Write a protein that binds this ligand. Structure first.
Ligand SMILES: Cc1cc2nc3c(=O)[nH]c(=O)nc-3n(C[C@H](O)[C@H](O)[C@H](O)COP(=O)(O)OP(=O)(O)OC[C@H]3O[C@@H](n4cnc5c(N)ncnc54)[C@H](O)[C@@H]3O)c2cc1C
Ligand SMILES: O=C(O)CCn1c(=O)oc2cc(Cl)c(Cl)cc21
Ligand SMILES: [Cl-]
Length: 448
């Protein structure tokens, strides 16, 4: 039986542990945090995420989809809250088969842990990777107190998140060709209780957005009708706009309350614990990190956030990480050797990770910050109606299909240019020749 050591019992690491263990690999998975399945007297994490077709299909292959979906809330569409305008749902797809699912992060992680153990993986908690000696094939782990433990390894999988210790260890034996693109927005998680969401008639089966140009709020529903709200706001005000809102200006919870009362007046009354949440929940950091290299020979490989940190504006990081886990297990299972598997996995996934990193950055303006847009959207709908196997909106290709991200991006670019050019010198749809636009669709977009 082939042996593997996985660092990080998060989403990708646990899924790849199950896929490999059920194929007979001897799997040891190491996690810095305690086992979340061991109930303590501490209050649990209300953190949630959007599960889409890529993630759901990965869970389906693993035999875990039904269990995960049993505690997921359907989000049929985007509910945009602009003061004055009544909120009106913008459906994501054609029917309820084209939806996204809101799931509690910790619940997803517990289901994956049970799944990895049921397949035969051994999971070791309270052990964070500190260093790797590639030449001697040993690694060093430690608990929070720094009590060290050394282990021999044969194949090392870094599924240890955006601040990957495996990636840091690889960077000492190979040039990873890392390019870091910092994101000016920080984030803060806030809560809407079930009583407040019901009192204000906040739709449970939708993804909610409060756009505000350079900043915005989003909310995802929970099974109990509470919502987790995320504020995206610049860490600091730029030199060009010193007065512009930023986390630096929000000195305490009371300052945060005044900011919400002014900028998000229909949201502030639903946020009963705004002051406490603001002061007790730390401000998160966002970034895009691109690597030229994801592996060291046949010895180690990165996947998920360890390989390609991305901004969260498309809700695709976990989806991508689960898609990576499937691809990695498939390559490892069937390759001539580990070195061939890792090189093939990297070559296949790198262009797709670059594509979703670029599309995630682009989705921010779509959510937060039109006259030409409406006519383009209108013409796009007719083209999707006339040619449903050729004209598929980029959001649908990314969210509801398994088309490689790079292909979704390439087809999306053709569509965006086609629409932009077609509407360019026209006031309305009546002056636009629909057959000439459809001609371009049949000429430039092969059927899927
Ligand atoms: C604000 C925000 C919202 C998001 N919303 C969505 C969404 O709606 N949909 C979506 O698809 N994605 C979303 N994402 C992205 C998603 O959270 C990540 O892409 C995903 O969790 C990556 O999975 P992973 O397994 O690679 O890493 P992680 O889930 O971070 O797991 C890494 C694991 O490694 C462990 N670890 C770290 N260092 C060590 C070490 N040295 N030794 C041992 N263990 C270690 C960690 O404790 C953790 O258990 C969001 C991200 C952010 C920041
Ligand atoms: O474009 C939209 O209507 C939503 C995009 N999105 C998503 O699907 O899941 C998400 C999760 C988060 Cl955290 C963010 Cl910021 C956006 C999304
Ligand atoms: Cl994301």
């Amino acid at each position: 039986a082939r042996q593997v050591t996985i660092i990080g019992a998060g989403l990708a690491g646990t899924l790849v542990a199950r896929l490999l263990a059920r194929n007979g690999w001897q799997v040891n998975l190491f996690e810095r945090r305690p086992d979340p399945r061991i109930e303590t007297g501490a209050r649990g994490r209300s953190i949630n995420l959007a599960l889409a077709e890529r993630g759901a299909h990965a869970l389906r292959l693993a035999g875990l989809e039904r269990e995960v979906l049993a505690e997921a809330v359907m989000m049929r569409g985007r509910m945009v809250h602009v003061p004055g305008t009544p909120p009106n749902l913008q459906p994501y797809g054609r029917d309820d088969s084209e939806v996204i699912w809101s799931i509690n992060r910790d619940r997803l992680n517990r289901i994956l842990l049970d799944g990895a153990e049921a397949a035969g993986a051994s999971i070791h908690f309270n052990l964070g990777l500190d260093s790797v000696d590639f030449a001697r094939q040993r690694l060093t782990l430690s608990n929070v107190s720094g009590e060290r433990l050394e282990k021999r390894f044969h194949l090392l999988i870094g599924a240890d998140g955006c601040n990957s210790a495996v990636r840091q260890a690889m960077a000492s034996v190979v040039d990873l060709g890392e390019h870091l693109e910092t994101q000016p927005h920080g984030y803060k998680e806030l809560q809407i209780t079930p009583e407040a969401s019901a009192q204000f008639n906040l739709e449970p089966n939708a993804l909610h957005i409060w756009p505000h140009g350079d900043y915005m709020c989003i909310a995802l529903p929970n099974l109990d009708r509470s919502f987790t709200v995320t504020l995206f706001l610049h860490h600091q005000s730029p030199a060009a706009q010193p007065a512009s809102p930023s986390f630096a200006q929000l000195v305490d919870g009371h300052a945060a309350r005044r900011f919400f009362q002014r900028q998000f007046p229909d949201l502030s009354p639903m946020l009963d614990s705004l002051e406490q949440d603001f002061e007790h929940h730390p401000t998160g950091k966002l970034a895009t990190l691109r690597l030229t290299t994801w592996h060291v020979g046949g010895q180690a490989v990165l996947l998920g956030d360890a390989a390609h940190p991305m901004v969260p504006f498309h809700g695709q990081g976990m989806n991508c990480a689960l898609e990576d886990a499937v691809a990695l297990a498939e390559h490892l299972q069937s390759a001539a050797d580990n070195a061939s598997a890792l090189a093939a996995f990297t070559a296949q996934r790198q262009p797709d990770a670059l594509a979703i990193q670029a599309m995630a950055l682009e989705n921010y303006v779509e959510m937060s910050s039109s006259p030409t847009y409406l006519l383009e959207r209108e013409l796009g709908q007719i083209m999707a109606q006339r040619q449903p196997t050729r004209f598929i909106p980029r959001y649908s290709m990314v969210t509801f299909s398994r088309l490689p991200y790079a292909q979704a991006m390439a087809r999306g670019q053709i569509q965006e240019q086609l629409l932009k050019f077609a509407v360019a010198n026209h006031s309305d749809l009546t002056s636009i020749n629909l057959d000439a636009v459809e001609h371009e669709v049949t000429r430039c977009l092969p059927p899927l």
